[PDB]
Design a protein around this ligand. Sequence first.
Ligand SMILES: Cc1cc2nc3c(=O)[nH]c(=O)nc-3n(C[C@H](O)[C@H](O)[C@H](O)COP(=O)(O)OP(=O)(O)OC[C@H]3O[C@@H](n4cnc5c(N)ncnc54)[C@H](O)[C@@H]3O)c2cc1C
Length: 431
Amino acid sequence: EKHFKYVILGGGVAAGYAAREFAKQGVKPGELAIISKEAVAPYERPALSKGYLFPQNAARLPGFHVCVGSGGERQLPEWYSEKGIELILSTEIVKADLSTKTLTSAAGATFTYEILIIATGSSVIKLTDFGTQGADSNNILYLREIDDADKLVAAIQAKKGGKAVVVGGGYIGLELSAALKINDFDVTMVFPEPWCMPRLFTADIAAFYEAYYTNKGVKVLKGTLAVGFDANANGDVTAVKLKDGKVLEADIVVVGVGGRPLTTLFKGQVAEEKGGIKTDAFFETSVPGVYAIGDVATFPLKMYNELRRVEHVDHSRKSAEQAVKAIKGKESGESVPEYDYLPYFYSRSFDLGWQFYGDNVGETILFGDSDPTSSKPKFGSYWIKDGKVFGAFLEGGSPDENNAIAKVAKTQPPVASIEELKKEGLQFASK
Ligand SMILES: Cc1cc2nc3c(=O)[nH]c(=O)nc-3n(C[C@H](O)[C@H](O)[C@H](O)COP(=O)(O)OP(=O)(O)OC[C@H]3O[C@@H](n4cnc5c(N)ncnc54)[C@H](O)[C@@H]3O)c2cc1C
């Protein structure tokens, strides 16, 4: 049995950023441990569906370790060991007892703590949840962690020049379809929803991506459902069957149908809210000395006066800093300001790149040029509720223009006339 004053459970983005805050706050050797089921030090996860999948000049570790993704310094495994921070890799915790402050691994090793920081992220929803026949076939892959990314890279080489089907229509389904196309695959996207990224995109925003992807050679089958998979004598996938009877040939199948907060170890031990571990404005759970950050946390989103849960890389870096600041502040009888996060998400595929700030609530106003054949497309959208701008999206914006739409989402400016807003468009944020 090993004991540490602070234990971080998980080794992803929030864990790496929490360790950086711990080092900045002064942490003595032997105080902090990080237990991860992955075999590598914390890395910037968004790179896994972007640069990691490039056919040439691909991003590889140690290059994209935290905190380079936000302009910070790189944390190789040596960064942890030189500071006396024990990085405990390839160790999966299968039991957590908050009353006895004990975590147990699959091989039976036990770890105790004084402060626990839950940073377990999300697990992928598999097609087994829907009872999809043949979902267990080989070459049917998911993409969450670097292990999956290495498997995907290897399968891309083995089946290069063949047919790929991506199941899912969110930003992951779009990013993986783009990745398979640039790796010389014949790619089809199947998703039951009427348009891609239906949780954020409107039909107007999605129409641009659908037409852009079609020009790139991708077949976007919206309003389509994969009901089964054919496999050969070897067990490898050979086809994806759809609800309508149509069959698509497939050498590889990549799935991106979402995830769920990885809160299993603590069910019944902590208060929950909307699928996440409920926390206050400092990320502390219903259990004193237990904190929850990143994807797992359902926290007060101060500017919206509601409890919210997000799958954002900015939130994962920021909530980690906030939780450590609160823990270290408490040691000196000090308090820290309440977490004031502005929702921010971004995606990348082909030569495109969009940014989203705020809340996608109310009615939307599309501005700019949404022609997918244009050499430099630049369009966006504003979300208006109660006569104020709540959300802002922009594809093809510059650093100045992205800061302008982030400024608009933060200040929630009044829209006196939507006729004037439709006249100014992006200039409304830029002025
Ligand atoms: C492929 C991909 C692309 C993305 N692209 C974007 C993007 O463009 N923009 C954006 O804003 N966000 C993006 N995201 C989301 C963003 O990366 C996440 O929100 C962020 O990584 C979550 O931080 P986290 O610390 O909460 O979780 P994670 O980064 O997932 O870390 C959780 C860690 O806990 C570990 N763990 C879990 N359970 C256990 C256990 N029992 N024992 C030990 N270790 C355990 C996991 O192995 C992992 O290391 C992307 C995510 C993925 C998967």
